[PDB]
Design a protein around this ligand. Sequence first.
Ligand SMILES: CCCCCCCC/C=C/CCCCCCCC(=O)O
Ligand SMILES: CCCCCCCCCCCCCCCC(=O)O
Ligand SMILES: *[C@H]1O[C@H](CO)[C@@H](O)[C@H](O)[C@@H]1O
Ligand SMILES: [Cl-]
Ligand SMILES: [Cl-]
Ligand SMILES: [Mg+2]
Length: 466
Amino acid sequence: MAFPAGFGWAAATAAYQVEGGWDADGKGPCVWDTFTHQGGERVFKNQTGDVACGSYTLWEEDLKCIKQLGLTHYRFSLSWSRLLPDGTTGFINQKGIDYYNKIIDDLLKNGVTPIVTLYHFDLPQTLEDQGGWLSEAIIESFDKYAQFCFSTFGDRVKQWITINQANVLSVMSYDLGMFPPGIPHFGTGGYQAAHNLIKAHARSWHSYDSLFRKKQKGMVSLSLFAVWLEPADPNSVSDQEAAKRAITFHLDLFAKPIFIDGDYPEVVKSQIASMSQKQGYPSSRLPEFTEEEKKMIKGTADFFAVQYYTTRLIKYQENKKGELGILQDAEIEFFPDPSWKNVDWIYVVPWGVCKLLKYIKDTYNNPVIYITENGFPQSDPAPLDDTQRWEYFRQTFQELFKAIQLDKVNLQVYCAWSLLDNFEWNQGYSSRFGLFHVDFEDPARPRVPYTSAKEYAKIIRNNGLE
Ligand SMILES: CCCCCCCC/C=C/CCCCCCCC(=O)O
Ligand SMILES: CCCCCCCCCCCCCCCC(=O)O
Ligand SMILES: *[C@H]1O[C@H](CO)[C@@H](O)[C@H](O)[C@@H]1O
Ligand SMILES: [Cl-]
Ligand SMILES: [Cl-]
Ligand SMILES: [Mg+2]
């Protein structure tokens, strides 16, 4: 199984998850600083990213990891509140700029290509206090942030993710309220946030296109969380239609307006409007794009960035009562096949990635695809000699090979989440996705390879597997 010559082998981190230095050198607070510091068991053992892997302090140790692996690309994110403490260029933290420039320069001198995420679940607290993604104000705040990043780093960065997993962000932060700012708005906040996320992304793409592309000649997209979905009963038509609809809801809701025609999927619009009307809303809970917004949003992605971890079965679940929520709008329930292995919510279903990639090819006109996050967590106690997890990677790589070779999917980059064990959001440090083990009890936060790191390096060296 030899991959395409020039295939990109990457690993990924995100700023809140690895950096620490949460208030170092004039950095502003982000919503996770606020959220974690508030405690009340919303995170595992009330843990925080105050220090995390210490990558703000220990970038040189990250670079060693990256060099050992022989990555061709490295994905990391910029901390908006580190660069722009109040979210705006009124005040710019040069030490923030200098830190990210050092990563970018050190990458390039080592022949590693940066893939840079502007925003990864970590709003400046000031902008969240201004309504965050529930207010229209965010669009311009984000656009000006994106322009500042393009202007500052774009001379050396040619691959950008504007927003990490906008679909997960809108649900977790604003619908379920499991992420900051932590207020449930079931069936309303997710769609309201999604509307602004989609628009902020599109505006930032146009800013790149009209101001930076000619000179910098890079490409810009946003990443999306994707769970592959199969009908619970393969013979049930309602389940087949349900699995389709669940994909359309969670994935195409964002990808269709950006990649296809500037508007939401029709079944999304119809299910929500219909539900919304029976619930007594004077408006659909799904905000409409205006004709001008549809025109601005359409075609604002230079490649398809996807995250994949797992698959679910889907069963139709009629919303008889007119209950409020996204699942009830989609009229579905989801569950694993009881035969699947899991660690936390990651049920091991490597063929799901193949099906997802072929779906992306078929639905989004055979785009360039980057897998910007994929991997496997271990629980505590996590063995350094993680031979079972590595087996899961190997099965995943065989499926990527299948997608490329059999299905002719234009997958060009694969990025392992993560370079490092890190702060897994509400799981805190209890969930270890790293290729490198980090000891969070030791103040030096030493990095030590798992077996998966040594094995991944060999895949990279050989550009494929046997
Ligand atoms: C621990 C929970 C498992 C999390 C991963 C599985 C997610 C599968 C979601 C796909 C269903 C698509 C329908 C959109 C539902 C909105 C999401 C939600 O409110 O839960
Ligand atoms: C508002 C549009 C709907 C989009 C739905 C897609 C996002 C579904 C994710 C919700 C549950 C997943 C929780 C795991 C996320 C995480 O911990 O990183
Ligand atoms: C990228 O996104 C995945 C899925 O949400 C996380 O598990 C990970 O920690 C990273 O932030
Ligand atoms: Cl970020
Ligand atoms: Cl996922
Ligand atoms: Mg991603």
